[PDB]
Amino acid sequence: EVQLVESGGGLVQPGGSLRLSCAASGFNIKDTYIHWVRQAPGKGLEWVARIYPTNGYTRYADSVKGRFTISADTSKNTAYLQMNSLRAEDTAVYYCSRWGGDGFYAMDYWGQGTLVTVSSASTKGPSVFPLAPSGTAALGCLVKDYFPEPVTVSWNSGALTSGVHTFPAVLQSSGLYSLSSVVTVPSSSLGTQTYICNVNHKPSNTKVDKKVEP
């Protein structure tokens, strides 16, 4: 019943501020060290800060010293990371972990990881376009021009999952993400069944269900 949940991330202007919370359940943070480890979109794992909530002893990475502040609250069993003077370098998924056994078990439990995007382009909803084919039949939806990550694409409201491929998002030259999500279905069902992709976007509050048929 030990789990850590992070929240408070999202898009933020360069140099702006953002606070991240790390609520712990299943143990009291007063007994362990609390860490913040980020992962750049595609790179490895970079340690940011540490805190001992009993007395608040904080050590920070040299790349965030002076700009970031870590804090805890034993009465709430929640850790905090105050991020200031944010740059595009800080754009990453920020995890929160503990040190079990006062360091003997290392970072055993990790959080689900909330991502922080540090850019200046405004949020934009995607434009969903169909892809008509000619099982030698394949159709998909073009999720083009949106910002920022992430986006979720399902087919037939989750009922169609066998042989579905949703490609990762590539950043276009216009600073807008774009991806496609195709599916390989039997050819003897292009005028019988109905293929609908569900492109949901939470940052821009966009919900499109573009039906695909030749």
Binding site: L45, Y95, A106, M107, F167, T184
Partner: protein, 213 residues
């Protein structure tokens, strides 16, 4: 401080192989090194703690060892559900430093890519932009050259590629190249085709279409 040169960067091994990931330290760190498995999209998870102690829940096929300043992760029988990037970290001196990261893929037999060509959507030409997508469905290995041909003339630098992770079933891959143009330029041509070159093919495969035909 203390670096962590984890090698190799990427490897491939079929089902049942003995995988060995090497993680050399930069100085004396004693037995304070741990290993982490991170499947794509999700959070890292602990495998071995304190050099050579298996964590609760991790199968017995995982094990670690320490030989001075070198720490090796060992997988006895590699399973298909081990597709993930592995990391090694030390906690002897603050700050904790992670390894470069070793991505492990499952090696299988060579498969041919199913090539599909997609004309732009009429709902998109109304906005003054066109995009042609070239699909490469289920193929192994990962290397594949996708070059676009317009009016049988070789185009370049106007399309972006994207490859998925290794599939959970047929451990292959999928690629999509999107040729982004515009309505003012997409209609100034006639033939659109993408050429596919892969090890599973004897000759390059080409799927074409004439605009409106």
């Amino acid at each position: 401080d203390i670096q962590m040169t984890q090698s190799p960067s990427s490897l491939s091994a079929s089902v049942g192989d003995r995988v060995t990931i090497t993680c050399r330290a930069s100085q004396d760190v004693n037995t304070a090194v741990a290993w982490y498995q991170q499947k794509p999209g999700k959070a890292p998870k602990l495998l071995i703690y304190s050099a050579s102690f298996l964590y609760s829940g991790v199968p017995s096929r995982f094990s670690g060892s320490r030989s001075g300043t070198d720490f090796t992760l060992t997988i006895s029988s590699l399973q298909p559900e081990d597709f993930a990037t592995y990391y090694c970290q030390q906690h002897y001196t603050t700050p904790p430093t992670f390894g470069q990261g070793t991505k492990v893929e499952i090696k299988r037999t060579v498969a041919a890519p199913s090539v599909f060509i997609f004309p732009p959507s009429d709902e998109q030409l109304k906005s003054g932009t066109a995009s042609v997508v070239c699909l490469l469905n289920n193929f192994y290995p990962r290397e594949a050259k996708v070059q676009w041909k317009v009016d049988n003339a070789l185009x370049s630098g106007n399309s972006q590629e994207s490859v998925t992770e290794q599939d959970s079933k047929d451990s292959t891959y999928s690629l999509s190249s999107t040729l982004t143009l515009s309505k003012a330029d997409y209609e100034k041509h006639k033939v659109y085709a993408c050429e596919v070159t892969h090890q599973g093919l004897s000759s390059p495969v080409t799927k074409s279409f004439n605009r409106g035909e």
